[PDB]
Amino acid sequence: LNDIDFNTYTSLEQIDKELLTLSIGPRSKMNTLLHLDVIRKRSKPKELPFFLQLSGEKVGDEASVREGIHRRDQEAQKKLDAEEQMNKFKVTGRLGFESHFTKQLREGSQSKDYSSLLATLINFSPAAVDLEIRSLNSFEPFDEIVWFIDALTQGLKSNKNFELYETFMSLLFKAHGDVIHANNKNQDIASALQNWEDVHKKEDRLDDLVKFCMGVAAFVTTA
Amino acid sequence: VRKLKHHEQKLLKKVDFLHRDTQVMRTYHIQNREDYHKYNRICGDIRRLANKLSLLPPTDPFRRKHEQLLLDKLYAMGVLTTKSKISDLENKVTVSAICRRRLPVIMHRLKMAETIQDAVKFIEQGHVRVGPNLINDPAYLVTRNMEDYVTWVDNSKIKKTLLRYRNQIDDFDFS
Amino acid sequence: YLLVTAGETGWLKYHDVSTGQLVSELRTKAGPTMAMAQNPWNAVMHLGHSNGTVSLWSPSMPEPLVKLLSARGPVNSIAIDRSGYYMATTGADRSMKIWDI
């Protein structure tokens, strides 16, 4: 009633467990996430020898013409430029081996609950999120991917931040879709994806609702 | 400085740091010397565009299109009346043509005010309008169509008296 | 009959005012000239730069006739006796000099 006494009321976080909710934030974050890479590609900025070696047509050697008989250089020069920035940035500050995100994921796997991982994942910045999801690992045991899949499935069970959990899943399929498809039918990943699919086939009611509302709305307003 | 005498002229024939500009000042009453210089510089700009576009290869779609653009835009401005020539552009675009396009001169030939100075006084006193909106500064070159749609502002003493003489005043319009 | 207009881009122009033609136009490699005063026994322009150097210029040739190191920092002001014999320079490092030109 304190909200009454101050005649101002705050929206609830989530009304109920069965109710899908969105991230409390901008609606631009979904588009920015799903289309981050192309944003980079469109936001990159715009930009002798003494002994010459000429040819039989360029100089007057039509005889050698009638009996006629640099990309690797640019590749080498590109290598060289890479060396240049590589040793131009030379900070020796002492930084931890294991990044915060991957560590937090690790003990989340240990404890079999990913609450903190989801919290920090949502708190990330979009450029970051893309960076880490791209820079996961794909070794044989597939532990990191399995753990991340479990985290996303746990979140969809949580019924919060529905949009960001789906878009994280799509980003993972974008980056490491190749490996997951390749080593498909491996039992662990199969089970993980099967849980994910179970939750998602549970959620499709939202598609139903949106289609109904749109169809009826157009019918009423134009007929 | 002193209308200096014969011998000292011969020694100093060029020491005066103190008249077509003034001739136009008197004949069509343009506002200031800087105004006249402005018109001259405009004419020179046109001339140099002609020279450089001519230097451009005459057999170029770009050059010919840009030529037609320029000439049409000048015609729309109404400095000149023809369209079929370029030597017209190099010769008859004159400070005289621009200054006769000037608004009070338009008022005079279209017969708003009997004299150029009366026209300018009326522009100051705010009695004319071009299309919807009125005009306060005489140095206002009027486009072809607009100068065709010049007339007085409403409910001005000038229009009231004109209509009174005609005995065609009509107070419903609060003329 | 000569008008001297030293300013900020670092530049000194003699403008003959009777006939009306820029007689001379000398760049100063120094910088924004801080002070300026004319030697009248001599009619040579003393500019005072930010280095702490006075420089004596004449409209004929494009190099300083002479340069003096007066003070450190910049030179606020310079004034010249009417006989063009003595000069006084004041520089923003709280310094004052009396010079035998």
Add this chain to the structure above:
Amino acid sequence: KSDFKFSNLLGTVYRQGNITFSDDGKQLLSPVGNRVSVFDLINNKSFTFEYEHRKNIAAIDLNKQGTLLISIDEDGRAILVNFKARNVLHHFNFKEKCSAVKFSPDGRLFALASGRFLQIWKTPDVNKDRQFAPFVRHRVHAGHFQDITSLTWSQDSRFILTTSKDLSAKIWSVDSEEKNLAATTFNGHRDYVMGAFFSHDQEKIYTVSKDGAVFVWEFTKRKYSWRITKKHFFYANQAKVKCVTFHPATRLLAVGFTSGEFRLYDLPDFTLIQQLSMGQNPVNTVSVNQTGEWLAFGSSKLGQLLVYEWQSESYILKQQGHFDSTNSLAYSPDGSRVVTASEDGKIKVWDITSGFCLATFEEHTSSVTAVQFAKRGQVMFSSSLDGTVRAWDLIRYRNFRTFTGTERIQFNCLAVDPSGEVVCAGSLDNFDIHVWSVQTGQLLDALSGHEGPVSCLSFSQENSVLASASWDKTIRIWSIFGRSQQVEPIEVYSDVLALSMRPDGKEVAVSTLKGQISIFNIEDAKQVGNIDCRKDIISGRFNQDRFTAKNSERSKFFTTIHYSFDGMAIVAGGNNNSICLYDVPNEVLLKRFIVSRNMALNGTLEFLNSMRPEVRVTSVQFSPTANAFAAASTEGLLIYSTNDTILFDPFDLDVDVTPHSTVEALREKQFLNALVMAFRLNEEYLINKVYEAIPIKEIPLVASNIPAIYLPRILKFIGDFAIESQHIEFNLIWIKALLSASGGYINEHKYLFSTAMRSIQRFIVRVAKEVVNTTTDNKYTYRFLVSTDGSM
């Protein structure tokens, strides 16, 4: 409904002066001509301060604790304002032209570089109730010889660096004892000085020149003082430093030259982190986030503002406002986008919900004269003096077509059929309405019959007719479909010059040159009624005039009219200083806003205080969400809104309807009664509370039993809440239940639920299909990645 606050300003993201970041680094404050725009970066939003100044803002600053904002215009006139409420606290008058302002990082006091004196004031408390005269001086110093060109505080709040055109940099202290400590100067330096900074430990002092020289002074020994430890140089050809900023905690020096180059250096070792060219015009202002990660750059010549993130090389925002003057306006059919056309040909597409510039279009050449949409989300047409009418998409963002006449004739006004199939354009050199087909492209014909230029056009979007109005003192209603080609001419008393049409499609409203807004019924071709406007217009005087601001008809008429979407209200604007909001059915004015108090703009003084930019409203429109309206004027795209709703506007109350009674209704579980009483009170927070209170298994019963008087208000509220609320299927269950329970009523009175259905479908289209499309994409990706055979 008749109250509007100035809620936003679009275009001109930066005009002149200092740019700053907020404490949290989440907000960028920019000075626009009179006011201050706040761009909230993480939540992707914008905002503009209601108060104006008298002239252009010359400097800003934000208190570090994120509470106070001082803003000074070009004559010492300073306004001190609060944020957490956005109100003006005081306004003092520092008599000389200020040059820079800074709040000491303690916040206790702020310094002020004006001319060649340094001024240091204490700063008023905010928690303190509004005092009368709270500004108090703390010190004045006059050690310089020319203008103080830049200023800096120390990290501890005890020392001030001032750089002046005397070629010098001065350390002043704030106390007398520390004056004794370091009251020191810094000489020996080339063309100008443009910044001075303490290092992190403060034993090193950097001075950045104008020629391009950096001096590292360092308190070392040859009884010893401030040697010039090192000299670094930029090397630009002729470009010169224009503005510099130094983040000490990460040792960044960002420098913006006059050629449009800007560089980032790491300072002590002095390495070039990077270098970019923003444009061919000088970079005019710089600032740095506190965490060192975001750089803000302002260039004034084009009014372009950039926020860059150098760690990751990513542009958080890169907008550039219009150059000349927003000539015309158009809203998207649902209300999300706004397209504005300059006097240059720049046609920019803005998004509203985040006040940003989604795109620009440059394919026009001369000034654009009118812009308009279809009754569809697809297309958009523009008309310019170019002699062309250009048809753009807005899903691929590209021209369909360039309609044009035959003689390259300039087009003043535009209109488009509802079916998006016929395009009509009215010139001024021909006074024939040229009519093109969309899909074919080649112009059908020239509707002729006016004499004198065709001032404006529009289409009745129900009978699908067009009214065309001309300086022939006349209106002309054409039916141009189906075998007939029939005309109907009506006469007004004087030159019509603006026109608009009832959304239902029955009436026209035409503003003439006497300043009377006549209103006609179409089918009867008769005059339903007119509204005088001559006296309720605040024109402006001209400093070059010889007469008064009353007895001149300089802008005594309205060149822009538009209806509201209930068809009950009219917004009007012209070359005058006023935007007047009338209402049709009773012929009166509801409101009058003054567009700008800025004596720089010409017609802004009513009595002068004993060629140039004038103020004028080129075109107005309502919003298809009918909670806000926009006016495109010489200073940009002003947007007034109602989204405050700080107002007790009840409806059909009775003595027993109180918020406490509503809460008691909730507790005793009559959800229908609670909702009805909530609307009867008509208060947003109570509506919100009850709405989120009632349960799902009972929503359908409520939707069944809501009274028909409250169907429209509930639909509208649901739409305007479901845009920015995160309870999707809550809103969707609600909407589905509403449509199910009452559909036939809405179909029978579609014109009454227009804006309601518009908002609902906007919610579903813009922020529901997107979630479901991503869902579908993931579902199919999973199906394919599992179903198919593996690799190898």
Add this chain to the structure above:
Amino acid sequence: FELSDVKSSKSLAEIYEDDYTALSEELQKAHSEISELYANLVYKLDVLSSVHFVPKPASTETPTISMEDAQPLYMSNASSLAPQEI
């Protein structure tokens, strides 16, 4: 075209270097110049014959940014193409 009956300023070494290394750069130079000066002219005339203030249009290496971009900055050209034309 026309030959050059004046002495060649660059010897064989140089002309072969040139053969070792938009139609005519001089042509684009003249094109840009005439465009700029014509913009100046139309400025002058619009100031003279308009009714409302008009500003001077503009002023007239290293990597550059593009502040205008006639796409929403997140749309791929693969998505701006239409199926008929591909």
